[PDB]
Amino acid sequence: KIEEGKLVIWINGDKGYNGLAEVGKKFEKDTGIKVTVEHPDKLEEKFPQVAATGDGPDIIFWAHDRFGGYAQSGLLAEITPAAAFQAALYPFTWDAVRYNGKLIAYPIAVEALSLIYNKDLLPNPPKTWEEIPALDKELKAKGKSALMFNLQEPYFTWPLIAADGGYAFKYAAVDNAGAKAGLTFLVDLIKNKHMNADTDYSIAEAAFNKGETAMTINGPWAWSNIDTSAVNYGVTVLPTFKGQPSKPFVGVLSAGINAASPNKELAKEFLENYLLTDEGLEAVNKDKPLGAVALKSYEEELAKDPRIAATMENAQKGEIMPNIPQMSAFWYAVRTAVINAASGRQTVDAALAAAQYQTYIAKSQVSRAVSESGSLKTVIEDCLNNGKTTVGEAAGECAIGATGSNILDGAAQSGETLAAGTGVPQVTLANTGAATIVATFGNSASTALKSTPTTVTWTRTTDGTWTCESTAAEKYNSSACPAA
Ligand SMILES: N[C@@H](CCC(=O)O)C(=O)O
Ligand SMILES: N[C@@H](CCCC[NH3+])C(=O)O
Ligand code: NA
């Protein structure tokens, strides 16, 4: 249970958590409020499960696109910043932390794709997609290709697909016309052999960092690898398409306040008047760079770095990453259509009209149940090898310490507190050392997993070996837990 009087913070391990902790040691100096910054593994998965019972951190830092799901579950507190504070952040960043017209988190950092180019190969990088074919032919006559970037993930081609507004098509005849024009141009690049349909993230990054291609498309997370390489690189605005800017998806690292937290007034003070200052954001940016930031005053000091300036410019011309869970199936279909077109599996027309989202969800939920139940194996080994063969909360019994999961049905066996609509895997032990861990799908599991009785079961043999068996369809299973 969250302890009143103190702030606990969760932030990913690739962020400046030591720098944030320095912001926080200052907070305890001007209060009596200790602060602790933790960077737990898989914190974005743990948070909804801990917060459901009133546990977890007071503040969580993560990309805004996850916070729509937390907000839908009522796990984030609505924040009410005064106008004086809101005017200190770029207006579009507040849009990323809105859910049902309510502010749900504080924007911190802003990321988007940019055009990265090798200054030695290409001192005059193109301002338009249209001129890339001719430049590719010229560079190849000089021993290099024009452009390599990840074509397997539509996130990377989206800036071109979303560029054309399609307003001109209306006058020649918003819907899908602009996306058709962008996709058709992408498909033509590939058929004319200016790009390969099989180019993925690893191939493109290796090519650019080895100096084999003049341009790539990537975000700030990729810069340090190019820094290590020999490449004299620059970062600039994405090229235009049909005279209109590329529109990349925008990710906004945001700080939400746990709705079960009893220190909401304490967290509001720390985030607004300490972290989101020029001083607070520098203490984190000194540790590990945030890229572009939502704070106007600090972002103006970072824009001297052309890489950071280009990131914010592309972000301001793009669109905020979708965060509405009710729209997830729509966007999964959009992703599927883009891959089918780019890969040449379908025409542009047929792709935008034709891999089930249910399969992705069912596989993910099965894998989650396998991992959730499997995480109890080491606990059970500790019990069995210390002679404890009864599950329970009393002394001398095996206390499972399970965490409730909203895709499972199963009451706690060792005194754990579960929220409604959650369950834990069910543990049985025997004096022989045999054991089972049975996770039964229920509550908010997919109908794909609830339409018949369906389980994932870890079985311990008396030699101490474990195996996993699923009664879900093999279509939704993995090698870790096959069907019988
Ligand atoms: N990273 C997810 C993305 C799927 C989605 O877009 O919903 C995957 O395994 O493909
Ligand atoms: N594991 C079961 C059975 C205990 C031992 C049965 N001989 C339980 O604790 O509920
Ligand atoms: Na080449």
Automatic annotation (TrEMBL):
Signal peptide: none
UniProt entry keywords in alphabetical sequence: Fimbrium, Membrane, Methylation, Transmembrane, Transmembrane helix
Domain of life: Bacteria
Gene Ontology biological process terms, A to Z: cell adhesion; type IV pilus-dependent motility
GO cellular component term of the entry, any: type IV pilus
Record keyword Transmembrane present: yes
Disulfide cysteine pairs (residue numbers): C383-C398, C468-C481
UniProt KW Transmembrane helix keyword: yes
Family, per entry: Belongs to the N-Me-Phe pilin family.
Protein's name according to its UniProt entry: Prepilin-type N-terminal cleavage/methylation domain-containing protein
Residues of the full protein shown: 28 to 157 of 157
